[PDB]
Amino acid sequence: ARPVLTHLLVALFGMGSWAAVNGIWVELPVVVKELPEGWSLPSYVSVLVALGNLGLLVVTLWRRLAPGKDEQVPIRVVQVLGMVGTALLASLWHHVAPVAGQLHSVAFLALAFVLALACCASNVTFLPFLSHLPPRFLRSFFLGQGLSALLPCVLALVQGVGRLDFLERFPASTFFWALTALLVASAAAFQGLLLLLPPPAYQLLSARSACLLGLLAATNALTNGVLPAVQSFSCLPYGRLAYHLAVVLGSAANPLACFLAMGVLCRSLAGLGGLSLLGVFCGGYLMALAVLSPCPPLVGTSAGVVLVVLSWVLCLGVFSYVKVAASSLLHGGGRPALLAAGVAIQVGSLLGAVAMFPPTSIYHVFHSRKDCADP
Numbered sequence: 001a002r003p004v005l006t007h008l009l010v011a012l013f014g015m016g017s018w019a020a021v022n023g024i025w026v027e028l029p030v031v032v033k034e035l036p037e038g039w040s041l042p043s044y045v046s047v048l049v050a051l052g053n054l055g056l057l058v059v060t061l062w063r064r065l066a067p068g069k070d071e072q073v074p075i076r077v078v079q080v081l082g083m084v085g086t087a088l089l090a091s092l093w094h095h096v097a098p099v100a101g102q103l104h105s106v107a108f109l110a111l112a113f114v115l116a117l118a119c120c121a122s123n124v125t126f127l128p129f130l131s132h133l134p135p136r137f138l139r140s141f142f143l144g145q146g147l148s149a150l151l152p153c154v155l156a157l158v159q160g161v162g163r164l165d166f167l168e169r170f171p172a173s174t175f176f177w178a179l180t181a182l183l184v185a186s187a188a189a190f191q192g193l194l195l196l197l198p199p200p201a202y203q204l205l206s207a208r209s210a211c212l213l214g215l216l217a218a219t220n221a222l223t224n225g226v227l228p229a230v231q232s233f234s235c236l237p238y239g240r241l242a243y244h245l246a247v248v249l250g251s252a253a254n255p256l257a258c259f260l261a262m263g264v265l266c267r268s269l270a271g272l273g274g275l276s277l278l279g280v281f282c283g284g285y286l287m288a289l290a291v292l293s294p295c296p297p298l299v300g301t302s303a304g305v306v307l308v309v310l311s312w313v314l315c316l317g318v319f320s321y322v323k324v325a326a327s328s329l330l331h332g333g334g335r336p337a338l339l340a341a342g343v344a345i346q347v348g349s350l351l352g353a354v355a356m357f358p359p360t361s362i363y364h365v366f367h368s369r370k371d372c373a374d375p
């Protein structure tokens, strides 16, 4: 009866989805300076988030053994897991211990693994719950899910991450406590959304429903496995302004794509194929730039900064739009159709991360750049 309030509440509910991982990733530079691992930490966090897909195996087993039980119990378990994990991370992130003879960060990595589990279960737990609503709220859900990534980047901007050795404006404790506040707000918004709602076969093997799952898997394998790995190697040779602009504008291109989808939405499979193609084009240009990390073409000229920022903006916006559109097309099916859309996203992301591990952590194909020097 009150559509704007429902839009706001579903937006906040969706915002509290992937905030912990998207905050850890942006905070990595402040933490790296103290931990004994060094700059090998982004390859540990990646493997942890890839292994976190065991939350699906637990959600499925609980949905099997308890067949007709309630549907809001996994949502609340995931929310409490996230809140308590972020509090414990804010409290005990700097404890090291000798494992295998080497000093290692056990508390940081264990809590990152728990948060990855919660965030991976959040998909197959939160997304199918929107079958109780008209399809115009999937777009608000995804807009909030994009704000989930946009807000920590602004927080790291205010903190002063990446200023080059200056001392930030506040330590990592304040950052993780702000993340805890975000997660509590999301839990309260979902509790209100529960008060707002009234008291209570041939498709899976079709070609039209496989053409959408393949698109979801491929676009998510690109956006969630490869770009987080080649980001710095692509953007760093062009300075500190290029890197900051690329990061912030790529993070802000998701909510704007979801707003544009709120405006007009595509519904033909061929249009989504074309959009995915023009996104893969830029996604491949970025990696072709990252392979030549020492000296890419057009370095030190104002053309390269623009040509490397616009690629990130275009890629992330196009893929977010295709995700929103394909998910809204599969909503006609039910909770079963929506459940299929989360599993595909997660399988694609897992395949992307597993495929990106060997070029990055085994053979070292990309070569880093020494600061204040032009090789």
Ligand SMILES: Cc1cc2nc3c(=O)[nH]c(=O)nc-3n(C[C@H](O)[C@H](O)[C@H](O)CO)c2cc1C
Residues within 6 Å of the ligand: 018, 021, 022, 025, 045, 046, 049, 145, 146, 148, 149, 223, 224, 228, 345, 346, 349, 350
């Ligand atoms: C290392 C890493 C792995 C991620 N994996 C996923 C993922 O599997 N699925 C997902 O929806 N988002 C994942 N994200 C976040 C994804 O970009 C997220 O949808 C947007 O950040 C906010 O929606 C990941 C983010 C990072 C930094």
Ligand SMILES: Cc1cc2nc3c(=O)[nH]c(=O)nc-3n(C[C@H](O)[C@H](O)[C@H](O)CO)c2cc1C
Residues within 6 Å of the ligand: 029, 039, 040, 042, 162, 232, 368, 369, 370, 371
């Ligand atoms: C795997 C890896 C990731 C890196 N990530 C960043 C980064 O995110 N931001 C950055 O400024 N430098 C990054 N660097 C470069 C790092 O800052 C560089 O080694 C030091 O500046 C050299 O003193 C990275 C280097 C490596 C090897």
